[PDB]
Design a protein around this ligand. Structure first.
Ligand SMILES: C[As](C)(=O)[O-]
Ligand SMILES: [Mg+2]
Length: 190
């Protein structure tokens, strides 16, 4: 069955720090009977959009822990590197090991010229996706965690919305006492 709350979720956010493109998961043609034409998001739709802007994606990081949504070959056949990065389950935020894995991978690709984007997606494109992007911005790009979280909230509204995720990012990179409460969600979520 298609994931819950996916149909109304925007396919992509704005790019973050000129490098990361946050996305919800694509769903291949296997789900066409459950998804109306206007709401589809096959992998081809992402690559055709990038081609239309003369933009290349160097790497797509899939944080879903499943291969049931789309065919990784639809990404790889276009010359985009595909990585399935398994993250801590049970609703917990990504571990320090997961974040190191993500940073080790993305640092091999973030400095290409000409510039290319790194796509990042979980099922919906907000919590695991925003957590790992923020961790990279702080650890490798020297942004403050306040700036990272606020930029991700404006690029992919409403941003990270699990309060435990926000608190863990501030415990790791700032002052846990200053972590913001989760945002109030928009009506489309439910
Ligand atoms: C972004 As909906 C919970
Ligand atoms: Mg096909």
């Amino acid at each position: 069955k298609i994931p819950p709350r996916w149909l109304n979720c925007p396919r992509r956010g704005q790019p973050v720090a000129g490098r990361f493109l946050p996305l919800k998961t694509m769903l291949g043609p296997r789900y066409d009977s459950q998804v109306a034409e206007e709401n589809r998001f096959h992998p081809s739709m992402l690559s055709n959009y990038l081609k239309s802007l003369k933009v290349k994606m160097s790497l797509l990081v899939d944080l879903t822990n499943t291969s049931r949504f789309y065919d990784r070959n639809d990404i790889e056949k276009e010359g985009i590197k595909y990585i399935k990065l398994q993250c801590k389950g049970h609703g917990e935020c990504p571990t320090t090991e997961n974040t190191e894995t993500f940073i080790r991978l993305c640092e091999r690709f973030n400095e290409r010229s000409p510039p290319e984007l790194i796509g990042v997606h979980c099922t919906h494109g907000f919590n695991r996706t925003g957590f790992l992007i923020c961790a990279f911005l702080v650890e490798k790009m020297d942004w403050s965690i306040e700036a990272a979280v606020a930029t991700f909230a404006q690029a992919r509204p409403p941003g990270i919305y699990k309060g435990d995720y926000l608190k863990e990012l501030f415990r790791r990179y700032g002052d846990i006492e200053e972590a913001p409460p989760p945002p109030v969600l928009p009506d489309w979520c439910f």
